Amino acid sequence: MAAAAAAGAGPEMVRGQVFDVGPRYTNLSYIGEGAYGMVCSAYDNVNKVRVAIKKISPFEHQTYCQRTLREIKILLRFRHENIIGINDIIRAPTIEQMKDVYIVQDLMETDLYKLLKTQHLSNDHICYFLYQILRGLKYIHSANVLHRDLKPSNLLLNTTCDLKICDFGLARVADPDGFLTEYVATRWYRAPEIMLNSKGYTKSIDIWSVGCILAEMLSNRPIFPGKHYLDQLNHILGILGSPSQEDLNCIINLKARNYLLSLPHKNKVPWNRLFPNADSKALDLLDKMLTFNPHKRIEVEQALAHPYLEQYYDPSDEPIAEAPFKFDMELDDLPKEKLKELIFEETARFQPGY
């Protein structure tokens, strides 16, 4: 029976979840699952290669719609060796029938979170991985975009040591204006200025995150974990020591400034005691990325030029975006019904026969 033969070719199920990505994508296999999306590898029968596919089911939640739309708009506009690309986007032909969105990407082999569960990296690999993180970040920042959620699990790696940044659902254009109150699986990579509810978040929040990641590559343990922001801030102070007076009155939030001032003194702990086997140039750059004052924190192009990365630094081959993005959306107040229409519009170009 033709119908019986059609149902055999129907949607595959992975770990109990439906993945309706035929006819183009077949032979699905589980990769991973974030807080929002379910990721499988699949065979692309048109381009004849395996790909990664992330399924999101967002339309009942304003916050899921924001993440879906932001990731799609930003990654479709980015093109960089160290940033994951979107190859295709699968969804239903009518807005009425669209309930899931599948984002199709180049397939990577693992992520740095998984890799650090299984092995201690040599200094040479840490150096090259850190270079690539910063090289991709240089491009992101050149577009005037903040990633805002860098962490080991969204640094993808392949079998030839190539690294790509992914997971752009929180990425935003920088602007002087409830930041990062939405749920995330881990807050351990967030800059202290976010925890203190200072107002003017800048590119420096991403550099902090990269400093946390470097620390974790050096010891295979998170450097500033904690149950609550209070606990994380106490771990930051327990290592960096108490902030200076100059650093304090650079904080906009009078309330947070007051609490820190009440805290008992903490002396800075030297990095070589936390990381005794680590390269001293890696610890110098680490120190400059984990500086409390965001105004003093090293910038991405300065970090690329640091002596630790000198064998990879090449400004002639560290490309930037053609134009910095402008903020003309303010989609953080749009209702999820409006967000769904925009997602539908943004994904129309991938529909068969467009």
């Binding site: 890799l115 299984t118 090259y128 690539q132 790696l157 079998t159 040591c161 190539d162």
Partner: peptide, 17 residues
């Protein structure tokens, strides 16, 4: 995963100048 010699970007950096 089993992890500088085979990466394309690393080759460009080795062979600059």
């Amino acid at each position: 995963m089993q992890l500088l010699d085979s990466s394309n970007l690393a080759r460009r950096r080795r062979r600059r100048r």
